[PDB]
Structures are given as C-alpha cells and as structure tokens.
Write a protein that holds these residues in place. Structure first.
Motif, PDB file in Angstrom:
ATOM      1  N   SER A  28       0.808  -1.224   0.000  1.00 11.52           N
ATOM      2  CA  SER A  28       0.000   0.000   0.000  1.00 11.52           C
ATOM      3  C   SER A  28       0.847   1.284   0.000  1.00 11.52           C
ATOM      4  O   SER A  28       0.274   2.377   0.005  1.00 11.52           O
ATOM      5  N   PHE A  29       2.202   1.179   0.003  1.00 12.05           N
ATOM      6  CA  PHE A  29       3.063   2.360  -0.219  1.00 12.05           C
ATOM      7  C   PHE A  29       2.632   3.080  -1.496  1.00 12.05           C
ATOM      8  O   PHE A  29       2.426   2.421  -2.513  1.00 12.05           O
ATOM      9  N   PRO A  30       2.467   4.412  -1.492  1.00  8.48           N
ATOM     10  CA  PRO A  30       2.139   5.093  -2.756  1.00  8.48           C
ATOM     11  C   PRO A  30       3.272   4.935  -3.766  1.00  8.48           C
ATOM     12  O   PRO A  30       4.438   4.779  -3.377  1.00  8.48           O
ATOM     13  N   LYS A  31       2.941   4.984  -5.052  1.00  7.68           N
ATOM     14  CA  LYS A  31       3.960   4.794  -6.083  1.00  7.68           C
ATOM     15  C   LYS A  31       4.292   6.125  -6.728  1.00  7.68           C
ATOM     16  O   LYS A  31       3.520   6.619  -7.560  1.00  7.68           O
ATOM     17  N   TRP A  32       5.437   6.712  -6.337  1.00 11.59           N
ATOM     18  CA  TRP A  32       5.920   7.967  -6.905  1.00 11.59           C
ATOM     19  C   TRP A  32       6.948   7.671  -7.970  1.00 11.59           C
ATOM     20  O   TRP A  32       7.714   6.712  -7.845  1.00 11.59           O
ATOM     21  N   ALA A  33       6.959   8.507  -9.028  1.00 10.16           N
ATOM     22  CA  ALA A  33       7.983   8.482 -10.072  1.00 10.16           C
ATOM     23  C   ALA A  33       9.249   9.085  -9.540  1.00 10.16           C
ATOM     24  O   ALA A  33       9.201   9.915  -8.635  1.00 10.16           O
ATOM     25  N   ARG A  34      10.404   8.671 -10.079  1.00 12.13           N
ATOM     26  CA  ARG A  34      11.703   9.239  -9.703  1.00 12.13           C
ATOM     27  C   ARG A  34      11.848  10.655 -10.302  1.00 12.13           C
ATOM     28  O   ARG A  34      11.431  10.876 -11.433  1.00 12.13           O
ATOM     29  N   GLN A  35      12.451  11.587  -9.552  1.00 14.87           N
ATOM     30  CA  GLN A  35      12.855  12.910 -10.073  1.00 14.87           C
ATOM     31  C   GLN A  35      14.251  12.828 -10.713  1.00 14.87           C
ATOM     32  O   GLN A  35      14.981  11.886 -10.439  1.00 14.87           O
ATOM     33  N   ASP A  36      14.636  13.804 -11.567  1.00 11.66           N
ATOM     34  CA  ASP A  36      16.016  13.878 -12.056  1.00 11.66           C
ATOM     35  C   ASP A  36      16.870  14.541 -11.020  1.00 11.66           C
ATOM     36  O   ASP A  36      16.432  15.538 -10.433  1.00 11.66           O
ATOM     37  N   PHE A  37      18.096  14.000 -10.798  1.00 11.70           N
ATOM     38  CA  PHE A  37      19.141  14.532  -9.906  1.00 11.70           C
ATOM     39  C   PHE A  37      19.554  15.929 -10.243  1.00 11.70           C
ATOM     40  O   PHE A  37      20.018  16.651  -9.346  1.00 11.70           O
ATOM     41  N   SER A  38      19.415  16.330 -11.544  1.00  9.67           N
ATOM     42  CA  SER A  38      19.702  17.702 -11.943  1.00  9.67           C
ATOM     43  C   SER A  38      18.820  18.721 -11.188  1.00  9.67           C
ATOM     44  O   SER A  38      19.296  19.826 -10.948  1.00  9.67           O
ATOM     45  N   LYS A  39      17.570  18.378 -10.810  1.00  9.44           N
ATOM     46  CA  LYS A  39      16.810  19.332  -9.982  1.00  9.44           C
ATOM     47  C   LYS A  39      17.119  19.149  -8.472  1.00  9.44           C
ATOM     48  O   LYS A  39      16.869  20.063  -7.679  1.00  9.44           O
ATOM     49  N   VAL A  40      17.670  17.993  -8.097  1.00 12.47           N
ATOM     50  CA  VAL A  40      17.897  17.627  -6.690  1.00 12.47           C
ATOM     51  C   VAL A  40      19.157  18.313  -6.116  1.00 12.47           C
ATOM     52  O   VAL A  40      19.100  18.872  -5.018  1.00 12.47           O
ATOM     53  N   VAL A  41      20.287  18.269  -6.839  1.00  9.03           N
ATOM     54  CA  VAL A  41      21.502  18.842  -6.289  1.00  9.03           C
ATOM     55  C   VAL A  41      22.145  19.906  -7.204  1.00  9.03           C
ATOM     56  O   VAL A  41      23.367  19.882  -7.368  1.00  9.03           O
ATOM     57  N   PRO A  42      21.408  20.893  -7.771  1.00  6.96           N
ATOM     58  CA  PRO A  42      22.116  21.939  -8.534  1.00  6.96           C
ATOM     59  C   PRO A  42      22.990  22.755  -7.552  1.00  6.96           C
ATOM     60  O   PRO A  42      22.595  22.891  -6.394  1.00  6.96           O
ATOM     61  N   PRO A  43      24.166  23.295  -7.937  1.00  3.79           N
ATOM     62  CA  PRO A  43      24.838  23.210  -9.247  1.00  3.79           C
ATOM     63  C   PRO A  43      25.955  22.150  -9.321  1.00  3.79           C
ATOM     64  O   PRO A  43      26.967  22.383  -9.987  1.00  3.79           O
ATOM     65  N   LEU A  44      25.788  20.999  -8.644  1.00  2.00           N
ATOM     66  CA  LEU A  44      26.760  19.904  -8.737  1.00  2.00           C
ATOM     67  C   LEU A  44      26.951  19.474 -10.204  1.00  2.00           C
ATOM     68  O   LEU A  44      25.969  19.285 -10.924  1.00  2.00           O
ATOM     69  N   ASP A  45      28.209  19.333 -10.641  1.00  2.00           N
ATOM     70  CA  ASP A  45      28.501  18.898 -12.006  1.00  2.00           C
ATOM     71  C   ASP A  45      28.135  17.420 -12.213  1.00  2.00           C
ATOM     72  O   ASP A  45      27.749  16.733 -11.250  1.00  2.00           O
ATOM     73  N   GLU A  46      28.257  16.941 -13.469  1.00  2.55           N
ATOM     74  CA  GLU A  46      27.890  15.573 -13.855  1.00  2.55           C
ATOM     75  C   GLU A  46      28.731  14.533 -13.100  1.00  2.55           C
ATOM     76  O   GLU A  46      28.195  13.505 -12.724  1.00  2.55           O
ATOM     77  N   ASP A  47      30.034  14.797 -12.872  1.00  2.00           N
ATOM     78  CA  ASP A  47      30.849  13.860 -12.050  1.00  2.00           C
ATOM     79  C   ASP A  47      30.250  13.701 -10.641  1.00  2.00           C
ATOM     80  O   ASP A  47      30.060  12.578 -10.174  1.00  2.00           O
ATOM     81  N   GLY A  48      29.961  14.830  -9.984  1.00  3.31           N
ATOM     82  CA  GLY A  48      29.362  14.825  -8.644  1.00  3.31           C
ATOM     83  C   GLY A  48      28.001  14.154  -8.586  1.00  3.31           C
ATOM     84  O   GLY A  48      27.755  13.341  -7.697  1.00  3.31           O
ATOM     85  N   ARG A  49      27.114  14.486  -9.542  1.00  2.00           N
ATOM     86  CA  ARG A  49      25.777  13.885  -9.656  1.00  2.00           C
ATOM     87  C   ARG A  49      25.822  12.365  -9.875  1.00  2.00           C
ATOM     88  O   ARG A  49      25.055  11.643  -9.259  1.00  2.00           O
ATOM     89  N   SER A  50      26.707  11.895 -10.744  1.00  2.00           N
ATOM     90  CA  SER A  50      26.922  10.466 -11.020  1.00  2.00           C
ATOM     91  C   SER A  50      27.374   9.756  -9.754  1.00  2.00           C
ATOM     92  O   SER A  50      26.796   8.738  -9.398  1.00  2.00           O
ATOM     93  N   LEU A  51      28.411  10.279  -9.088  1.00  2.00           N
ATOM     94  CA  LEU A  51      28.869   9.734  -7.795  1.00  2.00           C
ATOM     95  C   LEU A  51      27.722   9.687  -6.759  1.00  2.00           C
ATOM     96  O   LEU A  51      27.495   8.626  -6.120  1.00  2.00           O
ATOM     97  N   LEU A  52      26.978  10.813  -6.609  1.00  2.00           N
ATOM     98  CA  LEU A  52      25.885  10.825  -5.636  1.00  2.00           C
ATOM     99  C   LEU A  52      24.821   9.760  -5.957  1.00  2.00           C
ATOM    100  O   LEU A  52      24.348   9.066  -5.057  1.00  2.00           O
ATOM    101  N   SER A  53      24.443   9.643  -7.239  1.00  2.00           N
ATOM    102  CA  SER A  53      23.462   8.628  -7.637  1.00  2.00           C
ATOM    103  C   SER A  53      23.900   7.232  -7.231  1.00  2.00           C
ATOM    104  O   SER A  53      23.053   6.460  -6.829  1.00  2.00           O
ATOM    105  N   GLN A  54      25.209   6.920  -7.328  1.00  2.00           N
ATOM    106  CA  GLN A  54      25.741   5.605  -6.947  1.00  2.00           C
ATOM    107  C   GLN A  54      25.728   5.386  -5.451  1.00  2.00           C
ATOM    108  O   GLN A  54      25.588   4.244  -5.008  1.00  2.00           O
ATOM    109  N   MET A  55      25.869   6.470  -4.665  1.00  2.00           N
ATOM    110  CA  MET A  55      25.833   6.431  -3.184  1.00  2.00           C
ATOM    111  C   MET A  55      24.403   6.302  -2.682  1.00  2.00           C
ATOM    112  O   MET A  55      24.196   5.890  -1.541  1.00  2.00           O
TER     113      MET A  55
END
Ligand SMILES: OCC#Cc1c[nH]c2c(Cl)ccc(Cl)c12
Ligand SMILES: OCC#Cc1c[nH]c2c(Cl)ccc(Cl)c12
Length: 278
Positions: free
Chosen positions: A223-250
């Motif tokens: 019964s958990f609601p089903k939310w769609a994933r957001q893009d990391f680009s709105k989550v951690v601006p202005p982190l660059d693509e290297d930083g965003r990629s690393l964070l996504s893996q963590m």
C-alpha cells in the motif's frame, strides 16, 4: 573520574553525554563520553568489549581516536581525542555563501578514506550525521561517535532490515554530500514513514526491478504510494555531472548495487581533489 576535570558539555546521544575535559595526568584536553551501563551488559559484557576493542584498534587520520576506556561505578567512560568544531556547526556558519566546492570534495574524499578503513576492519559507523563529523584548522575531517535524527538513515534500515551492511554508511554520507552542496537537508523526514516517503518522492518508490527483494522486507507495504523518480539535476544543482553520477551511486536503493567507499575513492569526481584550509 578524579583524573578528569569537565570544561563543558559538547554532545549528547542515546547512550551518553560527551564533555570537553582536561586529563590532569597528561595535561591533555579530550572528549569524555559517559555511558550508564545496564546490569544486563555488566553481567554479559563480552559483546560490548569485542565491539569497543574493534573501535579502539582503529588507527586512521580520518577517524577520531579512542584513547582510553574506563570501567568504574556501573559506568563506562570513553576518552576520545578532541576536535573544536563539527560539520553541522560549520555548514550553519557557511550557510550564506556555501562551503567552497574544493572543500566539499576534500571533506567527501577524506570521509570515504575513513569509511573504507572502517569497512575493511569490519566496523560500521551506523549513524553518520553532520554533528558527528569533526573538523580541525588543518583541513582534516574525522568520523566520530560511532553507533533522534532520521535524515541520514538508509532505506533498508527504515524498511526493517536487521542484518544491514557497510552500504548504510555510504547512503548517510551521500545525504551529507547533497546537504553540503545545496545547503538543505536532502531528506528531512520527521518520522520513519515521512523519512521513507521523502526518499520515495525523490528517488521513486522502489520495486523488484530497481531493488530485488524489496517487497519481502519486514516493513515493506504493498500500500506504499507509487511515486515516479525525479532527475538529480533538480535535486543537487549546481553539482557537475561527475558529482551527480557519484551521488546517484551512493543513493542506489539496492544495498548490493550501492557504491563501496573503496570504489567511490576512484570516481572521476576526485580527479582534481585537493586539501584546502577552511
Ligand atoms: O577495554 C577494556 C574494557 C572493558 C570493560 C569491562 N566491562 C565492560 C562493560 Cl560492562 C562494557 C564495555 C566494556 Cl569495554 C567493558
Ligand atoms: O554522543 C554525541 C556526541 C559527541 C561528540 C561531540 N564532540 C565530540 C568529540 Cl570532540 C569527540 C568525540 C565525540 Cl563522541 C564527540
């Protein structure tokens, strides 16, 4: 204890109070953690002693040293090396401008070194948060106060996994990384379910595809609601693509897909890493 004089309270956790204190024998200033022991652990102390010995043997530049252990008067005192500031107070003091990105990256790098060391010596932190990361004037940062804020708790813990892994520390450190970058807590939940649902609203509600075995977890509900994933680009601006990629893996849902501290050390994000003075 007669050999220590309290200077001031500096911390409080579930298990005890922490004071800045002076050691009358060495003249050194230390952090003194006082734990009231229940009679049950005094009767069966072997596990407590094994876990504290593992903490005591840790020798690494990015780990707060456990100097001494004193058992007396139904209490355990843990005597730690002392540092003057924590990352929470530093984040707060830096909130108008942000911690400079080279300093964020140096701190992240050093904490990954500390965690890689802990994790290879079968020690987990279990409760990483800005308040237990201690900083000095030389640009060092150190893991302290090894295992109520839920903000940094890994989703497998919130879903009732009892036998969790080193991956829980990587999750907490990822949350702290995002927080240094944006100057806002990533998942500021105020209850376990609100914590869970804040993670789900950002990363998408996990399923068997992204997290095989998730639906079989002790506290998982269909019964958990089903939310769609957001893009990391709105989550951690202005982190660059290297930083965003690393964070996504963590922040991978599956603890088995989540990056290790040792593999994170090798990520392209640390290619230009330096050690600035704060
Ligand atoms: O590291 C030396 C030691 C010791 C302890 C004696 N009794 C203990 C209890 Cl009840 C809990 C934890 C510890 Cl480390 C000790
Ligand atoms: O239990 C919560 C806590 C704490 C600490 C605050 N400052 C510390 C220093 Cl300087 C060393 C070791 C610890 Cl555990 C703490």
């Amino acid at each position: 204890m007669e050999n220590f004089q309290k200077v001031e309270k500096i911390g409080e956790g579930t298990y005890g109070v922490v004071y800045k204190a002076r050691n009358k024998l060495t003249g050194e200033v230390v952090a003194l953690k006082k734990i009231r022991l229940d009679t049950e652990t005094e009767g069966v102390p072997s596990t407590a002693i094994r876990e504290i010995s593992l903490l005591k043997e840790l020798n690494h530049p990015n780990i707060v040293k456990l100097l001494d252990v004193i058992h007396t008067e139904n209490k355990l005192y843990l005597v730690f090396e002392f540092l003057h500031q924590d990352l929470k107070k530093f984040m707060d003091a830096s909130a108008l401008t942000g911690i400079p990105l080279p300093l964020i990256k140096s701190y992240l790098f050093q904490l990954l070194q500390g965690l890689a060391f802990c994790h290879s010596h079968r020690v987990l932190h279990r409760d990483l948060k800005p308040q237990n990361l201690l900083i000095n004037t030389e640009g060092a940062i150190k893991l302290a106060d090894f295992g109520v804020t839920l903000w940094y708790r890994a989703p497998e813990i919130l879903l009732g996994c009892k036998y969790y892994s080193t991956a829980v520390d990587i999750w907490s450190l990822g949350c702290i990384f995002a927080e240094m970058v944006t100057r806002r807590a990533l998942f500021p939940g105020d209850s376990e379910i609100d914590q869970l649902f804040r993670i789900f609203r950002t990363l998408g509600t996990p399923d068997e595809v992204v997290w095989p075995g998730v639906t079989s977890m002790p506290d998982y509900k269909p019964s958990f609601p089903k939310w769609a994933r957001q893009d990391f680009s709105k989550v951690v601006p202005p982190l660059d693509e290297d930083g965003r990629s690393l964070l996504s893996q963590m922040l991978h849902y599956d603890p088995n897909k989540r990056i290790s501290a040792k593999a994170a050390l090798a990520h392209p994000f640390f290619q230009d890493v330096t050690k600035p003075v704060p």
